[PDB]
Design a protein around this ligand. Structure first.
Ligand SMILES: *[C@@H]1O[C@H](CO[C@@H]2O[C@@H](C)[C@@H](O)[C@@H](O)[C@@H]2O)[C@@H](O[C@@H]2O[C@H](CO)[C@@H](O[C@@H]3O[C@H](CO)[C@@H](O)[C@H](O)[C@@H]3O)[C@H](O)[C@H]2NC(C)=O)[C@H](O)[C@H]1NC(C)=O
Ligand SMILES: *[C@@H]1O[C@H](CO)[C@@H](O[C@@H]2O[C@H](CO)[C@@H](O[C@@H]3O[C@H](CO)[C@@H](O)[C@H](O)[C@H]3NC(C)=O)[C@H](O)[C@H]2NC(C)=O)[C@H](O)[C@H]1NC(C)=O
Ligand SMILES: *[C@@H]1O[C@H](CO)[C@@H](O[C@@H]2O[C@H](CO)[C@@H](O)[C@H](O)[C@H]2NC(C)=O)[C@H](O)[C@H]1NC(C)=O
Ligand SMILES: *[C@@H]1O[C@H](CO)[C@@H](O)[C@H](O)[C@H]1NC(C)=O
Ligand SMILES: [Ca+2]
Ligand SMILES: [Ca+2]
Ligand SMILES: [Zn+2]
Lengths: 535, 111
């Protein structure tokens, strides 16, 4: 579906204007889409500085882009609701010379068009382009493509699909609005000769015996096993024992030896392109409560030699021995290596160890707060419609307390999950301004793939605003100080606001697919950050 | 002095628009067979009447219309109004439904 003529290709960074007619929510959603491009491809963006062609993003009528680089510079529109990250990504893929997936030359081999069910005056939006206009990029037709239209698009009757997959399974899939598909990235990379993502700095799953070019220290006492996932309960996080002889994790036993013995696992040297990184990884701590998984940076001491240790975080055991996620904010502006010190404590009171798998290092802010809902499939059955879950209170960069309500069975939308952010009272509230307006919430259901190009994490975006009101609070702003707007909750010992976000955030039939659930663990990230500076 | 004239006009070619920008709101006839365009103009008018407490307004006619389906059914419209006369101003507005969230927008200029 890519425009063949190479003149229509951008040259990076694409310079952009954000027009001031854009809301803050739309400006912040655009910059968040750019981060996804930079994270999953070599596509890059820069502020405008008088270049011959550029995108200007606009809040015009509808949500639309000219296709490919118009060498005069071009509008993109982002009307209401197109603030969703995936719709920005779709329009930016049009800007990057891509037509809709059902507009491929071969589309009739893969999708039915029900012309009789299209609104009169809209059949041309299902035109297909000849192969002189467009390449296939030697790629198959992709139902999972972000460029594809959903079944109910331009239809006469809300119940009747305009477009359906000839493989009938994919009716439940076409026109996903999660993210780029793997083939959309494969196409985008073939179109722009991208070999390296701007922000994926490293990832590792240990599947290979060279352990992703990690090394073990010798200053430490001992070494981490590269562990074969073969033992009865001790499976890797990548494959969960799904694939025999193939799952791997680093493991550090603590059931024997002295306390305070350690092993360093230490990365290969890394060259950060930004001032900030998030080291994500998955871990277990089935050993003693006094075991300590310490993450360290070894950085360039400015001689050009990486030897300056910096402790950056510690993790400690719980009754939850299951694979747990972690995120460590690194702030490395010079070449470095991330290190895991597994440290024994009370080995006589340990029956296990510290485990690592699925490490990912991205040059981004970390998720501000992360919630793992365990045994989620089982929770989803046991949940009655209108039953709710609430995250522990997370704290934002500015110290605003917040959290998410999750209703697994949305009564509003049978077969969907509802996620709704709320502000929580916390230790800072008296100093913070209220209402907490202009703060962009980004909820994200993590697609648990270690390679960020394999992730399609579902993500929804809103910004707190004076617009948000209820008679339940005399039609004052929902985002006012939770002492005067929220209802006290005994479990958090905190006041939680009226909660806002999406019924229909994701369908159960979509959450189960794509590995979002993984080991029955619905990992939700949240960000809740000021965007007033975009004004 | 203009003695006499005749003019033939068209909306821009729908194929040539699609080829230039696939998601662009394709223009359509404004006649009463399009119930959903009338719903769009009356929703934007209802929003304008709810926003403007000083005076209330009624739909005379719909003068331009288009729609797009990406985030969901998304209609964009221009229409004429009178108070509650010769039509007093031109309205511009929209209606969009997602499966869950819904949006209406409006701006109007009096002559
Ligand atoms: C030995 O370590 C256990 C926990 O570690 C587990 O058991 C060992 C024998 C080894 O098999 C380890 O590999 C394995 O991971 C300690 O028991 C735990 O202690 C904590 C802290 O005292 C208890 O937490 C409290 O729990 C109550 C409710 O039960 C809460 O209200 C408190 O807020 C607090 O969280 C925890 O319950 C307990 N867990 C278990 C499974 O027993 C044990 O105390 C320790 N003993 C010694 C002598 O070091
Ligand atoms: C991605 O990589 C492609 C190669 O894999 C690049 O494709 C090459 O781009 C050249 C221009 O930059 C083309 O040169 C032109 O060739 C035609 C004949 O085919 C001549 O008429 C032109 O005069 C000549 N231009 C010049 C300045 O000499 C190459 O033919 C072309 N090769 C192929 C196999 O297509 C892409 O440019 C590159 N794209 C990006 C965005 O990086
Ligand atoms: C939308 O399509 C559905 C399915 O084709 C139509 O539903 C049927 O309507 C008839 C009456 O015309 C009923 O007797 C059937 O029982 C209905 N079937 C179902 C599955 O409910 C529906 O009428 C169409 N609506 C419009 C406005 O076109
Ligand atoms: C998850 O489910 C299994 C059985 O399916 C059960 O043994 C285990 O205790 C559950 N764990 C949690 C944290 O609920
Ligand atoms: Ca060692
Ligand atoms: Ca692994
Ligand atoms: Zn499109």
């Amino acid at each position: 579906n890519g425009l063949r003529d190479p003149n229509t290709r951008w040259t990076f960074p694409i310079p952009y204007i954000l027009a001031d007619n854009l809301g803050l929510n739309a400006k912040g959603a655009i910059l968040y889409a750019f981060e996804m491009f930079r994270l999953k491809s070599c596509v890059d963006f820069k502020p405008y500085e008088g270049e011959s062609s550029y995108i200007i993003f606009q809040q015009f009528d509808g949500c639309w882009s000219e296709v490919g680089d118009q060498h005069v510079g071009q509008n993109i529109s982002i009307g209401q609701g197109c603030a969703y990250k995936a719709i920005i990504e779709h329009e930016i893929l049009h800007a990057l010379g891509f037509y809709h997936e059902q507009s491929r030359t071969d589309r009739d081999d893969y999708v039915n068009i029900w012309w009789d069910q299209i609104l009169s005056g809209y059949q041309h939006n299902f035109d297909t382009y000849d192969d002189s206009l467009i390449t296939d990029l030697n790629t198959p037709y992709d139902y999972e493509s972000l460029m594809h239209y959903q079944p109910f698009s331009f239809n006469k009757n809300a119940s009747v699909p305009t477009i359906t997959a000839k493989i009938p399974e994919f009716n439940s899939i076409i026109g996903q609005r999660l993210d780029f598909s793997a083939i959309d990235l494969e196409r985008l990379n073939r179109m722009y000769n991208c070999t390296t993502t701007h922000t994926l700095l490293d990832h590792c799953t240990f599947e290979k015996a060279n352990i992703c070019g990690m090394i073990q220290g010798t200053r430490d006492d001992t070494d981490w096993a590269h562990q074969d996932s073969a033992q009865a309960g001790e499976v890797d996080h990548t494959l969960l024992g799904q694939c025999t002889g193939a799952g791997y994790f680093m493991q550090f036993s603590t059931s024997s030896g002295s306390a305070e013995e350690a092993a360093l696992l230490e990365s290969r040297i890394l060259y950060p392109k930004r001032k900030q990184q998030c080291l994500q990884f998955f871990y277990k701590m089935t050993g003693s409560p006094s075991d300590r998984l310490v993450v360290w940076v070894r950085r360039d001491d400015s001689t050009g030699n990486v030897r300056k240790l910096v402790k950056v975080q510690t993790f400690q055991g719980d009754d939850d021995h299951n694979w747990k996620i972690a995120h460590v904010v690194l702030k490395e502006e010079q070449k470095f290596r991330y290190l895991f010190q597994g440290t024994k404590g009370d080995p006589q009171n340990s029956t296990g160890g510290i485990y690592l798998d699925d490490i990912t290092l991205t040059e981004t802010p970390c998720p501000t707060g992360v919630w793992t809902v365990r045994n989620f499939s089982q929770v989803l059955e046991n949940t009655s419609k209108g039953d709710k879950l609430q995250s522990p209170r997370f704290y934002n960069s500015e110290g605003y307390g917040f959290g998410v309500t999750l209703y697994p069975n949305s009564r509003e939308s049978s077969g969907y999950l509802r996620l709704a952010f709320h502000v929580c009272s916390g230790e800072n509230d008296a100093i913070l301004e209220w209402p907490v307006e202009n703060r962009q919430v980004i909820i994200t259901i993590l697609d648990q793939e270690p390679d960020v190009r394999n992730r399609m994490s579902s993500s929804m975006v809103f910004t707190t605003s004076k617009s948000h009101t209820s008679p339940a609070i005399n039609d004052t702003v929902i985002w006012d100080r939770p002492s005067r707007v929220g209802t006290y909750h005994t479990d958090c010992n905190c006041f939680r606001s009226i909660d806002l976000g999406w019924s229909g955030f994701i369908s159960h039939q979509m959450l189960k697919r794509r590995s979002f659930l993984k080991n029955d663990d619905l990992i939700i990230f949240v960000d809740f950050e000021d965007i007033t500076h975009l004004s | 002095y203009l003695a006499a004239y005749n003019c033939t006009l068209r909306p821009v070619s729908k194929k040539k628009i699609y080829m230039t920008c696939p998601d662009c709101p394709s223009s359509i006839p404004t006649d009463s067979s399009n119930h959903q365009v009338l719903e769009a103009a009356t929703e934007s008018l209802a929003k304008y009447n709810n926003e403007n407490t000083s005076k209330q307004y009624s739909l005379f006619k719909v003068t331009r219309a288009s729609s797009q389906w990406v985030v969901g059914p998304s209609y964009f419209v221009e229409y004429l109004i009178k108070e509650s006369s010769v039509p007093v101003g031109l309205c511009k507005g929209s209606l969009t439904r997602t499966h869950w969230e819904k949006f209406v927008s409006v701006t109007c200029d009096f002559f």
